[PDB]
Amino acid sequence: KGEELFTGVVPILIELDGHVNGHCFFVRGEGEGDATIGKLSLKFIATTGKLPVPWPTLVTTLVQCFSRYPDHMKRHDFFKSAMPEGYVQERTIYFKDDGTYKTRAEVKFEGDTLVNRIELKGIDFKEDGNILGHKLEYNFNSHKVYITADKQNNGIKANFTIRHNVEDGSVQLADHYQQNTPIGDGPVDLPDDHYLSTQTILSKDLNEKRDHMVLLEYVTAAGI
């Protein structure tokens, strides 16, 4: 149960509420996810206008439940087990030599649609740094999301470090710390240590005048 909800294409809605150094923005996302192949397709819109932060910083924050979990690994899929009731996702993202994001998100089914609603607060960002000041290349590298059971929280923790390309040639690191807890009262799947290999392509809709991001992503589970 919960597995069944992802056999096939599921519609997605993402809403992001962001406050960074007294700036504010709202991102809205739509698209489809297909967990049997591990594919997300999504168009994001800055409803509140030109962003204060580069879109790539928002990628990890802007539905890991669409992750593809192979047949032998299926008992380790915590994300889909929390469904439909869903789960909570909290992150602390440390931008090396820069500010940090704190995020809280709820991911649950709402009728037909898989919804991810997020709150993000960003403190201590250098203005004219890589993040404020927009020095990041419009792209995304491949990453492994290391997942570990968190038994006393009835959820999971995750670690990874995002490599953001800087326009001058250097890299900007972003240490992710992650925590996921169910919204309901169980029972829930708790996995052996493993990780999610992810690949991502950021593009633009050529017809679209609003500040925005089109994203296509592939995620498969591995390590067992």
Min dist. Cβ of residue 27 to Cu ion (A): 11
Min dist. Cβ of residue 25 to Cu ion (A): 8
Start-to-end CA span in the chain (Å)? 23
Min dist. Cβ of residue 19 to Cu ion (A): 6
Contacts of 69-73 spanning 24+ positions with Cβ under 8 A: 69/35, 69/220, 69/221, 70/220, 70/221, 72/224, 73/194, 73/221, 73/222, 73/224
Min dist. Cβ of residue 131 to Cu ion (A): 18
Min dist. Cβ of residue 119 to Cu ion (A): 8
Nearest to Cu ion of 17, 106 (CB atom): 17
Does 119 contact Cu ion by CB under 5 A?
no
- 223/219 Cα distance (integer angstroms): 13
Residue nearest to Cu ion (CB): 17
Nearest to Cu ion of 24, 201 (CB atom): 24
- 159/133 Cα distance (integer angstroms): 27
Nearest to Cu ion of 17, 90 (CB atom): 17
Min dist. Cβ of residue 17 to Cu ion (A): 5
- 200/192 Cα distance (integer angstroms): 25
Residues 10-49 that bind Cu ion (CB under 5 A): 17
For Cu ion (CB under 5 A), the number of binding residues is 1
Nearest to Cu ion of 105, 156 (CB atom): 105
Nearest to Cu ion of 22, 187 (CB atom): 22
Nearest to Cu ion of 17, 85 (CB atom): 17
Binding site residues, Cu ion, CB under 5 A: 17
